[PDB]
Amino acid sequence: AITSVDSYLLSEIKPRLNTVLENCYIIDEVLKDFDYQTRESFKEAFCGKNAQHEVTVGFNFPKFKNNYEAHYLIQLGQGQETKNSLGSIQSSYFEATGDTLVESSTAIREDDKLVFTVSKPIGELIKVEDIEFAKYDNLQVEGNKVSFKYQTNEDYENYNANIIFTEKKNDSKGLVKGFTVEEQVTVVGLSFNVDVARCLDAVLKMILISMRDSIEEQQTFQLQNLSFGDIAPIIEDGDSMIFGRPTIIKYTSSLDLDYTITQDINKLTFKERKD
Amino acid sequence: AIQSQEKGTNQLDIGILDTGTAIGTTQLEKRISYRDRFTVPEVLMPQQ
- Packed helices A5-22 and A194-211: angle between N→C axes, nearest 10 degrees: 110
Which residues of chain A lie closer than 8 angstroms to B13, CB-CB?
60-61, 73, 75
Rounded-to-10 torsion of CA A206, A209, A215, A221: 120
What residues contact A180, with CB distance under 8 A and at least 6 apart?
A81, A82, A83, A84, A252, A253, A254, A255
CB A81 within 8 A of CB A180: yes
Cα angle A243-A248-A249, degrees, rounded to a multiple of 5: 135
List, comma-separated, the residues after which chain A is broken, a break being a C to N distance over 2.5 A; otherwise answer none: none
Any idea how long chain A is?
A: 275
Chosen from A56, A59, A61 to mutate, greatest number of chain B CBs within 10 A: A61
What residues contact B22, with CB distance under 8 A and at least 6 apart?
B2, B3, B4, B5, B6
CB A201 within 8 A of CB A195: no
- Is the Cβ pair A235, B12 closer than 8 Å? yes
Rounded CA-CA distance B19/B13 in Å is 16
Resolution, Å (one decimal): 4.2
What residues contact A15, with CB distance under 8 A and at least 6 apart?
none
> Which residues of chain B have a Cβ shorter than 8 Å from any chain A Cβ?
10-17, 19
Q: Which residue of B has its CA nearest to A190?
A: B14
Rounded CA-CA distance A210/A17 in Å is 11
User: Which experimental approach was used here?
Assistant: cryo-EM
Query: Mapping DSSP to helix (H, G, I), strand (E, B) and coil, where does residue A155 land?
Result: helix
Which residues of chain B lie closer than 8 angstroms to A242, CB-CB?
14
